[PDB]
Write a protein that binds this ligand. Structure first.
Ligand SMILES: *[C@@H](C(=O)N(CC(C)C)NC(=O)[C@H](CC(C)C)NC(=O)[C@H](CC(C)C)NC(=O)OCc1ccccc1)[C@H](O)C(=O)OCC
Ligand SMILES: O=P(O)(O)O[C@H]1[C@H](OP(=O)(O)O)[C@@H](OP(=O)(O)O)[C@H](OP(=O)(O)O)[C@@H](OP(=O)(O)O)[C@H]1OP(=O)(O)O
Ligand code: NA
Length: 202
């Protein structure tokens, strides 16, 4: 897995195939934030957007805090917003992975804050995300008590963004319908494994 998070102008574009089985979503709008230029991450970002295409915006964000919209209409973003951050979790520790798309929890927070400022300045949309869903492999401890997710929710706060964060402690996988799958003890992929996920709130 070659890490590529620099220069968003050089990233591959994406193609979304909307689905009909999407269903309801407690979010009026969402932004799928593609954190690295990796073929898998790109498709998972596209698939997630496809689950609620009409209200999903896909953005590509690099290490300079620069971005570009690669799908959807950011003018329509309004009401309760979600951000699904898509990338590879890497660098294992006693509290599981320590970096998403090559960024530590604190660095990710900074890029996201830089992003928020730019986005609001460009699209004139000062709506902060209501929830953040981290779509990368095991970025919180098994016990859900420590890890990347916990450093992140705190760094985000320190950076002007108070938000709830959902994160998984295990392996993660997005299917063609935009649905998440986690890996359990036996090593088989499953869905709705609540033991493999935690939701951090204020
Ligand atoms: C795991 C990681 O960070 N990560 C990124 C996702 C965006 C969450 N995982 C994947 O890359 C995963 C394979 C890894 C080896 C775990 N692949 C997918 O999620 C992939 C995305 C497609 C849209 C391209 N889907 C996939 O193969 O589907 C599996 C599936 C299909 C159908 C039903 C159920 C499951 C990180 O790299 C890590 O820590 O693991 C390395 C060993
Ligand atoms: O309505 P569902 O089919 O069960 O979809 C849910 C729902 O996502 P949608 O907004 O697309 O419905 C959850 O969103 P929340 O309202 O709970 O925030 C999401 O949880 P995250 O936001 O934490 O991702 C969860 O994903 P997960 O599998 O991680 O629980 C996902 O279920 P699917 O994975 O089946 O889409
Ligand atoms: Na739903």
């Amino acid at each position: 897995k070659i890490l590529h998070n620099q220069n968003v102008n050089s990233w591959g574009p994406i193609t979304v195939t909307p689905t009909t089985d999407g269903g309801e979503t407690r979010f009026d709008g969402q932004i799928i934030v593609q954190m690295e230029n990796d073929p898998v991450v790109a498709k998972a970002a596209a698939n997630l957007a496809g689950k609620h295409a009409e209200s999903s915006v896909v953005v590509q964000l690099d290490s300079d805090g620069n971005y570009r919209v690669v799908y959807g209409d950011p003018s329509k973003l309004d009401g309760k917003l979600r951000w699904q951050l898509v990338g590879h979790g890497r660098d294992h520790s006693e509290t599981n992975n320590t970096r998403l798309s090559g960024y530590s929890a604190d660095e990710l927070a900074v890029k996201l804050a830089k992003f928020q400022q730019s986005f609001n300045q460009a699209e004139n949309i000062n709506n902060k995300p209501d929830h953040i869903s981290i779509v990368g492999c095991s970025l919180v401890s098994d016990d859900k008590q420590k890890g990347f997710g916990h450093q992140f929710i705190n760094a985000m706060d320190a950076n002007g963004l108070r938000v709830d964060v959902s994160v998984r402690s295990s392996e993660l996988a997005v299917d063609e319908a935009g649905r998440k799958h986690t890996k359990d003890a036996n090593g088989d992929w499953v869905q709705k494994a609540e033991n493999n996920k935690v939701s951090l709130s204020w």
